[PDB]
Design an enzyme around this catalytic site. Structure first.
Site, short mmCIF file in Angstrom:
data_model
loop_
_atom_site.label_atom_id
_atom_site.label_comp_id
_atom_site.label_asym_id
_atom_site.label_seq_id
_atom_site.Cartn_x
_atom_site.Cartn_y
_atom_site.Cartn_z
N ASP A 162 -5.45 0.54 -4.44
CA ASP A 162 -4.55 1.21 -3.47
C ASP A 162 -5.00 0.86 -2.04
O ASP A 162 -6.21 0.89 -1.80
CB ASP A 162 -4.52 2.72 -3.73
CG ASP A 162 -3.96 3.12 -5.09
OD1 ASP A 162 -3.28 2.30 -5.76
OD2 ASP A 162 -4.21 4.24 -5.49
N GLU B 66 -3.40 11.04 1.28
CA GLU B 66 -3.64 9.70 0.66
C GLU B 66 -4.84 8.98 1.34
O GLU B 66 -5.65 8.39 0.60
CB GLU B 66 -2.38 8.83 0.72
CG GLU B 66 -1.27 9.28 -0.24
CD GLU B 66 -1.54 9.11 -1.73
OE1 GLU B 66 -2.44 8.34 -2.08
OE2 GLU B 66 -0.84 9.74 -2.56
N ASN C 250 -0.04 0.30 -4.07
CA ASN C 250 -0.78 -0.17 -5.27
C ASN C 250 -0.52 -1.67 -5.47
O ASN C 250 0.66 -2.08 -5.45
CB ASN C 250 -0.35 0.73 -6.43
CG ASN C 250 -1.15 0.49 -7.69
OD1 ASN C 250 -1.54 -0.63 -7.98
ND2 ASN C 250 -1.34 1.54 -8.46
N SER D 97 -6.34 -2.46 -10.71
CA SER D 97 -5.50 -2.48 -9.48
C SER D 97 -6.21 -1.71 -8.35
O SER D 97 -7.16 -0.97 -8.65
CB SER D 97 -4.09 -1.97 -9.75
OG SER D 97 -4.05 -0.58 -10.06
N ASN E 289 -8.49 1.64 -8.80
CA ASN E 289 -7.98 2.38 -9.99
C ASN E 289 -8.71 1.84 -11.23
O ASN E 289 -9.24 0.71 -11.16
CB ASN E 289 -6.46 2.23 -10.09
CG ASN E 289 -5.76 2.75 -8.85
OD1 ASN E 289 -6.02 3.88 -8.46
ND2 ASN E 289 -4.93 1.95 -8.20
N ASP F 110 -7.51 0.68 -14.04
CA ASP F 110 -6.81 -0.46 -14.69
C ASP F 110 -7.06 -1.77 -13.93
O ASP F 110 -6.42 -2.76 -14.26
CB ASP F 110 -5.29 -0.25 -14.81
CG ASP F 110 -4.55 -0.16 -13.49
OD1 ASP F 110 -5.20 -0.15 -12.45
OD2 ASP F 110 -3.30 -0.08 -13.52
#
Ligand SMILES: C[C@@H](O)CN1CCN(CC(=O)O)CCN(CC(=O)O)CCN(CC(=O)O)CC1
Ligand SMILES: C[C@@H](O)CN1CCN(CC(=O)O)CCN(CC(=O)O)CCN(CC(=O)O)CC1
Ligand SMILES: [Cl-]
Ligand SMILES: [Cl-]
Ligand SMILES: [Cl-]
Ligand SMILES: [Gd]
Ligand code: NA
EC number: 3.2.1.17
Length: 128
Positions: free
Chosen positions: A52, A35, A59, A50, A46, A48
């Site tokens: 991380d 990760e 998220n 959002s 991301n 959309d």
């Protein structure tokens, strides 16, 4: 902060992550490696809108507030910035709620594609 393998295992073990919901300590170290590369400061945007955050890439859609993800939830009740600290306490408490929510560690795409079904104990091999 960029963690060593044994260093991260001993911190996750101290915060109760070892066998949490039946997931051995090797599953968590494995997920962290793929990760974030063990870096608390990692961020990925991301499509959309959002983002991380931190060592387990939690998220902003559902779990923390970054003030720029419109109509999102904050179910860990923390600012996203708290997940970037050298102290992993916030990341660990937040992850406990995520892995408890029905889908287990499948919530972490890199755990699903690179750790699930593998020799995960190899990740804590040699640590005291
Ligand atoms: C512990 C030593 O292994 C340190 N190490 C020596 C060089 N290694 C030799 C080998 O690993 O057999 C090859 C390179 N290595 C590949 C890999 O590890 O998969 C990436 C860099 N590593 C990353 C890490 O090890 O965490 C640090 C340097
Ligand atoms: C070249 C060697 O480094 C071979 N190596 C296998 C043996 N390693 C060696 C070690 O790190 O001591 C121990 C297990 N290892 C733990 C970890 O690296 O964090 C996970 C698997 N790795 C993943 C990777 O390197 O990216 C596969 C390559
Ligand atoms: Cl393990
Ligand atoms: Cl927001
Ligand atoms: Cl599960
Ligand atoms: Gd390795
Ligand atoms: Na949010």
């Amino acid at each position: 902060k960029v963690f060593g393998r044994c260093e991260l295992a001993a911190a996750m073990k101290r915060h109760g992550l070892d066998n949490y919901r039946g997931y051995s300590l090797g599953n968590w170290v494995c997920a962290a490696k793929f990760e974030s590369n063990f870096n608390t400061q990692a961020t990925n945007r991301n499509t959309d809108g959002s983002t991380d955050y931190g060592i387990l890439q939690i998220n902003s859609r559902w779990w923390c507030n970054d003030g720029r993800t419109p109509g999102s939830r904050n179910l860990c009740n923390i600012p996203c910035s708290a997940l970037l600290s050298s102290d992993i306490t916030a990341s660990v408490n937040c992850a406990k709620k995520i892995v408890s929510d029905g889908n287990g560690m499948n919530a972490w795409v890199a755990w699903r594609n690179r750790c699930k079904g593998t020799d995960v104990q190899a990740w804590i091999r040699g640590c005291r």
